[PDB]
Design an enzyme around this catalytic site. Sequence first.
Site, PDB file in Angstrom:
ATOM      1  N   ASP A  24       0.822  -1.204   0.000  1.00 14.18           N
ATOM      2  CA  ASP A  24       0.000   0.000   0.000  1.00 14.18           C
ATOM      3  C   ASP A  24       0.858   1.258   0.000  1.00 14.18           C
ATOM      4  O   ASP A  24       0.492   2.265  -0.614  1.00 14.18           O
ATOM      5  CB  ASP A  24      -0.943  -0.009   1.201  1.00 14.18           C
ATOM      6  N   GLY A  25       1.997   1.225   0.694  1.00 12.69           N
ATOM      7  CA  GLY A  25       2.899   2.364   0.664  1.00 12.69           C
ATOM      8  C   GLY A  25       3.390   2.666  -0.739  1.00 12.69           C
ATOM      9  O   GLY A  25       3.391   3.819  -1.178  1.00 12.69           O
TER      10      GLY A  25
ATOM     11  N   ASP B 266      -3.538  14.202  21.803  1.00 11.24           N
ATOM     12  CA  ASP B 266      -2.322  13.984  21.036  1.00 11.24           C
ATOM     13  C   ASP B 266      -2.456  14.368  19.568  1.00 11.24           C
ATOM     14  O   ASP B 266      -1.438  14.636  18.922  1.00 11.24           O
ATOM     15  CB  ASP B 266      -1.882  12.520  21.136  1.00 11.24           C
TER      16      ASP B 266
HETATM   17  N1  LIG Z   1      -3.428  12.828  25.571  1.00 12.40           N
HETATM   18  C1  LIG Z   1      -3.412  12.958  26.902  1.00 12.40           C
HETATM   19  N2  LIG Z   1      -4.549  12.713  27.587  1.00 12.40           N
HETATM   20  C2  LIG Z   1      -4.534  12.817  28.919  1.00 12.40           C
HETATM   21  N3  LIG Z   1      -3.516  13.139  29.721  1.00 12.40           N
HETATM   22  C3  LIG Z   1      -2.404  13.370  29.015  1.00 12.40           C
HETATM   23  C4  LIG Z   1      -2.264  13.312  27.641  1.00 12.40           C
HETATM   24  N4  LIG Z   1      -0.961  13.593  27.266  1.00 12.40           N
HETATM   25  C5  LIG Z   1      -0.350  13.804  28.402  1.00 12.40           C
HETATM   26  N5  LIG Z   1      -1.154  13.680  29.509  1.00 12.40           N
HETATM   27  C6  LIG Z   1      -0.760  13.786  30.905  1.00 12.40           C
HETATM   28  O1  LIG Z   1      -0.232  15.081  31.134  1.00 12.40           O
HETATM   29  C7  LIG Z   1       0.819  14.957  32.109  1.00 12.40           C
HETATM   30  C8  LIG Z   1       1.696  16.193  32.074  1.00 12.40           C
HETATM   31  N6  LIG Z   1       1.025  17.391  32.592  1.00 12.40           N
HETATM   32  C9  LIG Z   1       0.830  17.411  34.038  1.00 12.40           C
HETATM   33  C10 LIG Z   1      -0.414  16.771  34.499  1.00 12.40           C
HETATM   34  C11 LIG Z   1      -1.370  16.173  34.888  1.00 12.40           C
HETATM   35  C12 LIG Z   1      -2.285  15.263  35.482  1.00 12.40           C
HETATM   36  N7  LIG Z   1      -1.934  14.217  36.213  1.00 12.40           N
HETATM   37  C13 LIG Z   1      -3.149  13.616  36.523  1.00 12.40           C
HETATM   38  C14 LIG Z   1      -3.463  12.470  37.274  1.00 12.40           C
HETATM   39  N8  LIG Z   1      -2.552  11.694  37.870  1.00 12.40           N
HETATM   40  N9  LIG Z   1      -4.769  12.146  37.403  1.00 12.40           N
HETATM   41  C15 LIG Z   1      -5.686  12.919  36.814  1.00 12.40           C
HETATM   42  N10 LIG Z   1      -5.505  14.019  36.081  1.00 12.40           N
HETATM   43  C16 LIG Z   1      -4.204  14.320  35.973  1.00 12.40           C
HETATM   44  N11 LIG Z   1      -3.640  15.386  35.304  1.00 12.40           N
HETATM   45  C17 LIG Z   1      -4.351  16.417  34.565  1.00 12.40           C
HETATM   46  O2  LIG Z   1      -3.900  16.423  33.224  1.00 12.40           O
HETATM   47  C18 LIG Z   1      -4.024  17.761  32.688  1.00 12.40           C
HETATM   48  C19 LIG Z   1      -2.650  18.184  32.202  1.00 12.40           C
HETATM   49  N12 LIG Z   1      -2.306  17.619  30.902  1.00 12.40           N
HETATM   50  C20 LIG Z   1      -2.439  18.296  29.763  1.00 12.40           C
HETATM   51  O3  LIG Z   1      -3.312  19.143  29.592  1.00 12.40           O
HETATM   52  C21 LIG Z   1      -1.456  17.953  28.662  1.00 12.40           C
HETATM   53  C22 LIG Z   1      -0.034  17.824  29.168  1.00 12.40           C
HETATM   54  O4  LIG Z   1       0.708  16.943  28.744  1.00 12.40           O
HETATM   55  N13 LIG Z   1       0.349  18.719  30.076  1.00 12.40           N
HETATM   56  C23 LIG Z   1       1.696  18.750  30.625  1.00 12.40           C
HETATM   57  C24 LIG Z   1       1.678  18.622  32.133  1.00 12.40           C
HETATM   58  C25 LIG Z   1      -4.618  18.609  33.815  1.00 12.40           C
HETATM   59  O5  LIG Z   1      -6.040  18.646  33.738  1.00 12.40           O
HETATM   60  C26 LIG Z   1      -4.173  17.848  35.062  1.00 12.40           C
HETATM   61  O6  LIG Z   1      -4.991  18.124  36.194  1.00 12.40           O
HETATM   62  C27 LIG Z   1       1.501  13.652  31.733  1.00 12.40           C
HETATM   63  O7  LIG Z   1       2.225  13.105  32.829  1.00 12.40           O
HETATM   64  C28 LIG Z   1       0.315  12.765  31.330  1.00 12.40           C
HETATM   65  O8  LIG Z   1      -0.134  11.962  32.414  1.00 12.40           O
HETATM   66  N1  LIG Z   2      -0.996   3.548  14.261  1.00  7.09           N
HETATM   67  C1  LIG Z   2      -1.386   3.196  13.030  1.00  7.09           C
HETATM   68  N2  LIG Z   2      -2.312   2.222  12.902  1.00  7.09           N
HETATM   69  C2  LIG Z   2      -2.725   1.884  11.677  1.00  7.09           C
HETATM   70  N3  LIG Z   2      -2.347   2.386  10.498  1.00  7.09           N
HETATM   71  C3  LIG Z   2      -1.435   3.351  10.659  1.00  7.09           C
HETATM   72  C4  LIG Z   2      -0.905   3.804  11.853  1.00  7.09           C
HETATM   73  N4  LIG Z   2       0.002   4.827  11.633  1.00  7.09           N
HETATM   74  C5  LIG Z   2      -0.005   4.973  10.333  1.00  7.09           C
HETATM   75  N5  LIG Z   2      -0.855   4.120   9.672  1.00  7.09           N
HETATM   76  C6  LIG Z   2      -1.136   4.082   8.245  1.00  7.09           C
HETATM   77  O1  LIG Z   2       0.068   3.809   7.549  1.00  7.09           O
HETATM   78  C7  LIG Z   2       0.023   4.527   6.303  1.00  7.09           C
HETATM   79  C8  LIG Z   2       1.421   4.635   5.726  1.00  7.09           C
HETATM   80  N6  LIG Z   2       1.946   3.350   5.247  1.00  7.09           N
HETATM   81  C9  LIG Z   2       1.335   2.854   4.018  1.00  7.09           C
HETATM   82  C10 LIG Z   2       0.122   2.044   4.219  1.00  7.09           C
HETATM   83  C11 LIG Z   2      -0.911   1.467   4.367  1.00  7.09           C
HETATM   84  C12 LIG Z   2      -2.265   1.037   4.384  1.00  7.09           C
HETATM   85  N7  LIG Z   2      -3.269   1.698   3.828  1.00  7.09           N
HETATM   86  C13 LIG Z   2      -4.380   0.926   4.145  1.00  7.09           C
HETATM   87  C14 LIG Z   2      -5.746   1.080   3.847  1.00  7.09           C
HETATM   88  N8  LIG Z   2      -6.245   2.099   3.141  1.00  7.09           N
HETATM   89  N9  LIG Z   2      -6.595   0.131   4.299  1.00  7.09           N
HETATM   90  C15 LIG Z   2      -6.103  -0.892   5.002  1.00  7.09           C
HETATM   91  N10 LIG Z   2      -4.838  -1.139   5.346  1.00  7.09           N
HETATM   92  C16 LIG Z   2      -4.017  -0.187   4.882  1.00  7.09           C
HETATM   93  N11 LIG Z   2      -2.648  -0.111   5.030  1.00  7.09           N
HETATM   94  C17 LIG Z   2      -1.800  -1.062   5.732  1.00  7.09           C
HETATM   95  O2  LIG Z   2      -1.103  -0.390   6.764  1.00  7.09           O
HETATM   96  C18 LIG Z   2       0.162  -1.054   6.992  1.00  7.09           C
HETATM   97  C19 LIG Z   2       1.256  -0.020   6.813  1.00  7.09           C
HETATM   98  N12 LIG Z   2       1.420   0.845   7.976  1.00  7.09           N
HETATM   99  C20 LIG Z   2       2.360   0.645   8.898  1.00  7.09           C
HETATM  100  O3  LIG Z   2       2.774  -0.474   9.193  1.00  7.09           O
HETATM  101  C21 LIG Z   2       2.894   1.883   9.590  1.00  7.09           C
HETATM  102  C22 LIG Z   2       3.173   3.017   8.626  1.00  7.09           C
HETATM  103  O4  LIG Z   2       2.904   4.177   8.922  1.00  7.09           O
HETATM  104  N13 LIG Z   2       3.728   2.675   7.465  1.00  7.09           N
HETATM  105  C23 LIG Z   2       4.095   3.656   6.454  1.00  7.09           C
HETATM  106  C24 LIG Z   2       3.409   3.368   5.136  1.00  7.09           C
HETATM  107  C25 LIG Z   2       0.196  -2.233   6.016  1.00  7.09           C
HETATM  108  O5  LIG Z   2      -0.323  -3.416   6.616  1.00  7.09           O
HETATM  109  C26 LIG Z   2      -0.727  -1.754   4.898  1.00  7.09           C
HETATM  110  O6  LIG Z   2      -1.260  -2.828   4.130  1.00  7.09           O
HETATM  111  C27 LIG Z   2      -0.640   5.843   6.675  1.00  7.09           C
HETATM  112  O7  LIG Z   2      -1.216   6.478   5.539  1.00  7.09           O
HETATM  113  C28 LIG Z   2      -1.708   5.400   7.685  1.00  7.09           C
HETATM  114  O8  LIG Z   2      -2.969   5.192   7.061  1.00  7.09           O
END
Ligand SMILES: Nc1ncnc2c1ncn2[C@@H]1O[C@H](CN2CC#Cc3nc4c(N)ncnc4n3[C@@H]3O[C@H](CNC(=O)CC(=O)NCC2)[C@@H](O)[C@H]3O)[C@@H](O)[C@H]1O
Ligand SMILES: Nc1ncnc2c1ncn2[C@@H]1O[C@H](CN2CC#Cc3nc4c(N)ncnc4n3[C@@H]3O[C@H](CNC(=O)CC(=O)NCC2)[C@@H](O)[C@H]3O)[C@@H](O)[C@H]1O
Lengths: 264, 264, 264, 264
Positions: B45-46, B150
């Site tokens: 696919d790539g 994220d």
């Molecule tokens: N996709 C994610 N989804 C959820 N959480 C994530 C994600 N990515 C990172 N984190 C956490 O962030 C911590 C780092 N943070 C500092 C923090 C925090 C924390 N710790 C806990 C806990 N133990 N239980 C419940 N709520 C918690 N929060 C709450 O989290 C918020 C802060 N985050 C952010 O907005 C983003 C960030 O990264 N900010 C930097 C500072 C605030 O409301 C805070 O009260 C990483 O360690 C990872 O855990």
């Molecule tokens: N967390 C993820 N989970 C799932 N898919 C992801 C994730 N991150 C990126 N991708 C896809 O990868 C495409 C990029 N790939 C190229 C590809 C591909 C593709 N396209 C489709 C489709 N339309 N339907 C069903 N399976 C598909 N696959 C399959 O995907 C696999 C290849 N991926 C990888 O191992 C990693 C990668 O990134 N590799 C680079 C080349 C192979 O089995 C291939 O037959 C990004 O575009 C994103 O979609």
Amino acid sequence: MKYMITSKGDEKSDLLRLNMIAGFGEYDMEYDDVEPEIVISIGGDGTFLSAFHQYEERLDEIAFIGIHTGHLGFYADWRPAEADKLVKLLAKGEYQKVSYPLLKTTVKYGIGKKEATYLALNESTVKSSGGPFVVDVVINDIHFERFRGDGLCMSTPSGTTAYNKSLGGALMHPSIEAMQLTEMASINNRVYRTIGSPLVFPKHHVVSLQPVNDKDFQISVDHLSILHRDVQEIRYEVSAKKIHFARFRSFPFWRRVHDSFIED
Amino acid sequence: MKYMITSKGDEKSDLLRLNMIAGFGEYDMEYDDVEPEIVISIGGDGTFLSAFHQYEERLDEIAFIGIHTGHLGFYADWRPAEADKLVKLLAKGEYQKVSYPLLKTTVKYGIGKKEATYLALNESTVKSSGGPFVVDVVINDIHFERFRGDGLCMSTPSGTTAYNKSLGGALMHPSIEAMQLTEMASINNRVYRTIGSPLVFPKHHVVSLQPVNDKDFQISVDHLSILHRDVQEIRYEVSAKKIHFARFRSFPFWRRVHDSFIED
Amino acid sequence: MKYMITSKGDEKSDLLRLNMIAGFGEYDMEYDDVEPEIVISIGGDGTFLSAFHQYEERLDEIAFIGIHTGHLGFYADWRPAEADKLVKLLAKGEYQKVSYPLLKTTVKYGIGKKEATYLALNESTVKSSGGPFVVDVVINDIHFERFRGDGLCMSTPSGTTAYNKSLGGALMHPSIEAMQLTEMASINNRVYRTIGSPLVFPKHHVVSLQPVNDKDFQISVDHLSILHRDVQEIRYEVSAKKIHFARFRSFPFWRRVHDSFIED
Amino acid sequence: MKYMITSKGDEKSDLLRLNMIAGFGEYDMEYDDVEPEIVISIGGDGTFLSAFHQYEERLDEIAFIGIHTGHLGFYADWRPAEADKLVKLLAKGEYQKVSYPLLKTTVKYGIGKKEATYLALNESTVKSSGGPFVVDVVINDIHFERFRGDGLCMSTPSGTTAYNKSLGGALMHPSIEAMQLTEMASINNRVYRTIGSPLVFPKHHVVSLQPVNDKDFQISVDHLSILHRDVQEIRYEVSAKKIHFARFRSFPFWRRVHDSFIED
Ligand SMILES: Nc1ncnc2c1ncn2[C@@H]1O[C@H](CN2CC#Cc3nc4c(N)ncnc4n3[C@@H]3O[C@H](CNC(=O)CC(=O)NCC2)[C@@H](O)[C@H]3O)[C@@H](O)[C@H]1O
Ligand SMILES: Nc1ncnc2c1ncn2[C@@H]1O[C@H](CN2CC#Cc3nc4c(N)ncnc4n3[C@@H]3O[C@H](CNC(=O)CC(=O)NCC2)[C@@H](O)[C@H]3O)[C@@H](O)[C@H]1O
Ligand SMILES: Nc1ncnc2c1ncn2[C@@H]1O[C@H](CN2CC#Cc3nc4c(N)ncnc4n3[C@@H]3O[C@H](CNC(=O)CC(=O)NCC2)[C@@H](O)[C@H]3O)[C@@H](O)[C@H]1O
Ligand SMILES: Nc1ncnc2c1ncn2[C@@H]1O[C@H](CN2CC#Cc3nc4c(N)ncnc4n3[C@@H]3O[C@H](CNC(=O)CC(=O)NCC2)[C@@H](O)[C@H]3O)[C@@H](O)[C@H]1O
């Protein structure tokens, strides 16, 4: 033209209904709950659903309007305090109709291939009566998977914000003529494999469920749950029929979604 | 007519390419990698994705064909052993074209409102360069939610089986002209709220992402990841452009899905 | 010592049982299905579950051994072809016992505060009899949430690979004395809010479910589903009782998990 | 005894810090940010996390106390208006200490088998630097799965309400000495298979990540993200070290959870 009003049945909804009827008495509006052209539902989404099913044989000749007496309903996009403006706007007319897709469920039985059909505005689900639920999933006559779990849910677009949503499904805009299938707690080990992801189907695609061992299934269309015995097949497709809403102001679907789930 | 062949680059794909060219030498087929009408991709696919992007400015004049040398690819629906029948069928012509929707991403910057657009066949994603990712999500100029997490993923129909799928998204049939938005690890507590469910958008709906504090975002279109600075807006919509496939036999999408995920 | 053997009931399992009994006849092994010290289960996980419940009042004096006649069972970690070595090793003794936690469910009714308790090896679930399921969730006498959905599942450690798993739960090693609560299709909008994530509870924490309106609940302990009326409370806690397995060779839990879900 | 105070750095937190120091000046409390016995953090969870890492080499001799100046923090369980009562209660002493488990991450490199260790209070994550993330997952020297996706997250108990939570993980009570592994967007088709469910590990179980092709990984411990080159192995285990909190009133973990996620 002709109209009728359903009510949730509490003192709040019945009084609002009586005041709207008295308001409608001052225009060229005849009350007729047999063959109306406007159906007004006063209550929640359940009240609206019952209004839809009560008149599901005249969907092409009816426009629906929802008023929510409590928490904001999804199909009920008018507040009680706006009922006067509603009566007035509705009496004038010149309103624009908006149409949402619907889902058709067909249940074929053994012995005579007897067949029942149902129309859903939210969704249609299947579960097992007691025992384990096992079903073969066939898409356009192609065997797709053997499903083991607690059941399946087939959702309309406007139904994706309901129950589909709690099963991990996607929310899709009602302008998309489609249906979405979601799993209820599928079994997935080395021997048993399902797709996992929800499935979105276009118009004219037919999803068919076929019993593997047990043939008794509890089938739910919107709010009514019916048991079926000696089932041979359950067929799902986007219906040819559509529900029509009367709209007097823009209330966009994603704004509706934002208000019901994000903040209001 | 005119044709060209891309290859994964290993000894298996290069040899298959050389034998197909020698096979094409016995018909009225001219090799031309500048302005072809048939693009054959040999690899996975790539490899197919790179073939699509190499010729994305002539999508209306090209039909694509995929051959997978290893594990079954999703866009590559021919096995190596069928290459002779492919050359022969393709030489005759009289093949039917099948068209899949595509996604358009627009990135507007500050200072001159400079603007870059990209076409995706799988998906387009956004992430933060280093720091926390925070973005306001606007649908058709309506503020829908503030997203903390994220990143986000905007998928085409044929891309829903890719990466959309691993983020909980729904698989939808490519005949549906739509795009699907999925979240990457959204934060949801009492202060921070997102919708959670994936979102499916019809044609002509515009999803716009707006920076809240940090304005640097790593944006990925299919396989290429580009960093953008001083971003003011990211716009998503179903593209007017379409990718066309050459089909010589029925390989239905749900059969394709069954073989790639259930059993083969 | 004393022993007994349960069988799935098909010709394969009954014959294997008869050959093992004849094998046991050549040692100091007495058959006694009243007060055994060794219970051998021949079949699948369901057969093992029934063996456990048949003797749940003598768990402190029994060691369990599982043989799977079909697909690998989770509690059945011996193949049919190893039955001779099993008889021989088991006759000698000097085997090491391994203990897994169990779950205690208590159902208190109105009118006399009558009370029933159950012991689960997989899980204990609650659903509504017909109507919508609504329950207040109290943790150690602290009101945690009002749950609206299809039901709840309270899982043992060794049960987390079962049904807990299909509801999104975590798989946890059986050495952890804990229980895990998972939701079945919780409703989550602006008015109705649940935690969403599964919950893992240590020993001595008491989860109590309290009816809000409807008081009739279908409660399932492992494989048996019982309807209860006029329910006032459902209490969950890690049990003081434990199931003991006889082990003759290392079969680590994560290897067991790898073989049942990844590849074998 | 000895104490110090960290602050978020805004005018609100700095003023609260200055008033608490002046309050502490009226007791037998010496300010010492080198070898304190009480560390007070004023800000949010991030501010608390930095306080923990600043003193991670004296965890056995320090008790931590969190004050949240904005939205309720998870580790900060005191409001600004209670700072006077805190100073007074803390000066008297006779407080009870509560201990939460911690996570140890070990990174072994090639060329000298050089080795770095880190202590996490929330979690430790791994991602790929640019390219695709592929890693072999080994549990207690048993090859469990080959993981393909965006990364992995290893969470402490008190960290399960953080980031673990957004990846589908379970929330577990901090009295359980364990660690939980969650996947970031795992690939799962016919060729690539992972477990899917989160995994909860007891003390003394060692999870080891091993590079398959690319050996460069961006590793994040709580809030700090470090790039590592020529990585040979990443090892995870529940740490022998523990963080100690000073408690002056019962604030149960599930009440803390209810207030941060359900309603407050
Ligand atoms: N996709 C994610 N989804 C959820 N959480 C994530 C994600 N990515 C990172 N984190 C956490 O962030 C911590 C780092 N943070 C500092 C923090 C925090 C924390 N710790 C806990 C806990 N133990 N239980 C419940 N709520 C918690 N929060 C709450 O989290 C918020 C802060 N985050 C952010 O907005 C983003 C960030 O990264 N900010 C930097 C500072 C605030 O409301 C805070 O009260 C990483 O360690 C990872 O855990
Ligand atoms: N967390 C993820 N989970 C799932 N898919 C992801 C994730 N991150 C990126 N991708 C896809 O990868 C495409 C990029 N790939 C190229 C590809 C591909 C593709 N396209 C489709 C489709 N339309 N339907 C069903 N399976 C598909 N696959 C399959 O995907 C696999 C290849 N991926 C990888 O191992 C990693 C990668 O990134 N590799 C680079 C080349 C192979 O089995 C291939 O037959 C990004 O575009 C994103 O979609
Ligand atoms: N596990 C479930 N999770 C989520 N939804 C479920 C679940 N099981 C059934 N349903 C839906 O209930 C409809 C039936 N309801 C009537 C209703 C409704 C409805 N429709 C939509 C919609 N289209 N979009 C967004 N919110 C919607 N709601 C909202 O739904 C709530 C009402 N549900 C209940 O509390 C339970 C119930 O069953 N009650 C009976 C009456 C209210 O807030 C209402 O504004 C079934 O059709 C099934 O969809
Ligand atoms: N939606 C559900 N998804 C997943 N599991 C579910 C679901 N509903 C109930 N269960 C489990 O079934 C147990 C009852 N079963 C007996 C069983 C079993 C069992 N136990 C474990 C375990 N501890 N770890 C890993 N796999 C396990 N399996 C495996 O489970 C399969 C058997 N299930 C069924 O096909 C349906 C059924 O109900 N059948 C009756 C007999 C077999 O492959 C068996 O090796 C209920 O207790 C509930 O846990």
